Amino acid sequence: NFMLNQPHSVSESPGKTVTISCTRSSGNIDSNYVQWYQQRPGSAPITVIYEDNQRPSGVPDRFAGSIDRSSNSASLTISGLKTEDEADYYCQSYDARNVVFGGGTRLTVLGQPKAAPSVTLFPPSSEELQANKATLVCLISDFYPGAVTVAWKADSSPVKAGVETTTPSKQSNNKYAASSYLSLTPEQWKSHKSYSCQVTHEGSTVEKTVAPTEC
Amino acid sequence: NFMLNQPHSVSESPGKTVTISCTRSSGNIDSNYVQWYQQRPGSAPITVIYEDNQRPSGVPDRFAGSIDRSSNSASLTISGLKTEDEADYYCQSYDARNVVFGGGTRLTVLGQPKAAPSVTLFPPSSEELQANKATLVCLISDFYPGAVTVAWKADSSPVKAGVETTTPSKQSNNKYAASSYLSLTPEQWKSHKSYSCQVTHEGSTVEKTVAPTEC
Numbered sequence: 538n539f540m541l542n543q544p545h546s547v548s549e550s551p552g553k554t555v556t557i558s559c560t561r562s563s564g565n566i567d568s569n570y571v572q573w574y575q576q577r578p579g580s581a582p583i584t585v586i587y588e589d590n591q592r593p594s595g596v597p598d599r600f601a602g603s604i605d606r607s608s609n610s611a612s613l614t615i616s617g618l619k620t621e622d623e624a625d626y627y628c629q630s631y632d633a634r635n636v637v638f639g640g641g642t643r644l645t646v647l648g649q650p651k652a653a654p655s656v657t658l659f660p661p662s663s664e665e666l667q668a669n670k671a672t673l674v675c676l677i678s679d680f681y682p683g684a685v686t687v688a689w690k691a692d693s694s695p696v697k698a699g700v701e702t703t704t705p706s707k708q709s710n711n712k713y714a715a716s717s718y719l720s721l722t723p724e725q726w727k728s729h730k731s732y733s734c735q736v737t738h739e740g741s742t743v744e745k746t747v748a749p750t751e752c
Numbered sequence: 753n754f755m756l757n758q759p760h761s762v763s764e765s766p767g768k769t770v771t772i773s774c775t776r777s778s779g780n781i782d783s784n785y786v787q788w789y790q791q792r793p794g795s796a797p798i799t800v801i802y803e804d805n806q807r808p809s810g811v812p813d814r815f816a817g818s819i820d821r822s823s824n825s826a827s828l829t830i831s832g833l834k835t836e837d838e839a840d841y842y843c844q845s846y847d848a849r850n851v852v853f854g855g856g857t858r859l860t861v862l863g864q865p866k867a868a869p870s871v872t873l874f875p876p877s878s879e880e881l882q883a884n885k886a887t888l889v890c891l892i893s894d895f896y897p898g899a900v901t902v903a904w905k906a907d908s909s910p911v912k913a914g915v916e917t918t919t920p921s922k923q924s925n926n927k928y929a930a931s932s933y934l935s936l937t938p939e940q941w942k943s944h945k946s947y948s949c950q951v952t953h954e955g956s957t958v959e960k961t962v963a964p965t966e967c
């Protein structure tokens with residue numbers, strides 16, 4: 538099957554225009570129809586676009602679907618942004634019986650200034666090593682909007698297994714914090730030169746690295 | 753045009769069978785295919801049923817779709833109910849003029865067992881101390897239910913400033929995780945013999961202690 542690649546997040550202030558892209562990994566974007574679903578936090582999904590650019594009745598003309606054959610993408614363009622437009626947006630298409638959804642885009646209608654995350658990566662604590670645990674923690678604090686993507690490297694290879702990332706929560710400064718932790722065994726930790734935690738926010742990626750040391 | 757009516761919520765104990773109905777307001781349930789989506793907190797939805805009763809790869813066979821033409825409904829039936837099945841469920845169908853979703857059913861799995869937190873306390877990294885910061889993190893994981901309280905100590909004394917604890921979130925093991933972080937200056941960290949993180953959950957307290965290094 539093909540994938541549909543959406544940006545993890547977008548933001549803009551009220552009244553502005555935002556575009557959300559949906560890139561088809563293989564085949565022709567024009568070969569099958571693209572739908573867009575809005576899911577407001579705590580709500581059921583709603584279709585805002587079907588068949589690339591058709592609006593269901595009740596969906597404001599502020600929402601526009603398009604297809605860019607040159608880039609093999611679909612886009613949802615929302616003009617005149619309102620606070621009610623804050624939601625996850627999903628694109629969806631198919632090859633044959635295989636329905637393919639995008640990973641979803643969080644749209645934030647800015648309610649406060651943007652803030653870039655503080656990122657701190659901690660190597661295993663002495664105590665946990667004695668319980669046969671080498672959990673690493675990546676603390677991510679003081680950010681806005683509340684949407685982040687976290688990726689871990691063992692040396693330069695993506696890690697998949699043993700990653701958990703908490704749902705960002707607003708702290709006492711009204712900015713978001715979260716932690717990602719990678720539950721390594723001491724064997725895994727020592728068996729690599731270094732581990733890295735990459736945090737993506739508002740399309741800038743920061744990275745921190747830790748390594749077994751002599752102390 | 754039509755709507756799909758689902759129960760707002762259903763509850764059941766492990767091992768039992770739960771049924772979630774989806775009633776089509778207008779036109780025949782059998783005129784168009786029904787899909788079912790599962791969605792866990794802070795995650796994107798997944799397909800559990802398509803074309804009324806087909807299970808995707810990797811969906812447990814405990815999930816069964818059906819159609820009842822006489823009550824003009826579709827049902828998702830979950831057998832041998834597991835804690836991991838706690839989620840929102842959405843039915844979805846079509847009418848050429850739109851893709852239509854149900855309002856969603858929140859399924860609660862009753863009688864989940866109390867689970868004590870794993871607590872790991874990380875002293876400041878050499879790298880953050882070099883950048884003039886001395887944040888500690890207390891990683892709290894695998895606890896149920898999803899409520900903790902955290903107190904910090906500098907030596908034996910209560911820490912009254914610089915503490916933040918994230919809102920617990922449910923992780924892939926269906927238990928909660930949170931981090932408490934204390935934002936010390938390097939001078940504060942080095943001025944004490946130790947700092948401690950005390951995690952209380954269901955009346956039981958776990959305490960961890962870290963001290964400045966010697967290298």
Ligand SMILES: CC(C)C[C@H]1NC(=O)N(CC(=O)Nc2ccc(C(F)(F)F)cc2)C1=O
Binds near residue numbers: 637799800
């Ligand atoms: C084999 C396929 C039919 C199912 C498989 N393919 C795929 O794209 N997913 C992810 C998925 O269903 N995502 C999804 C994302 C959003 C929604 C929506 F629109 F909010 F209801 C519904 C579904 C799957 O679980």
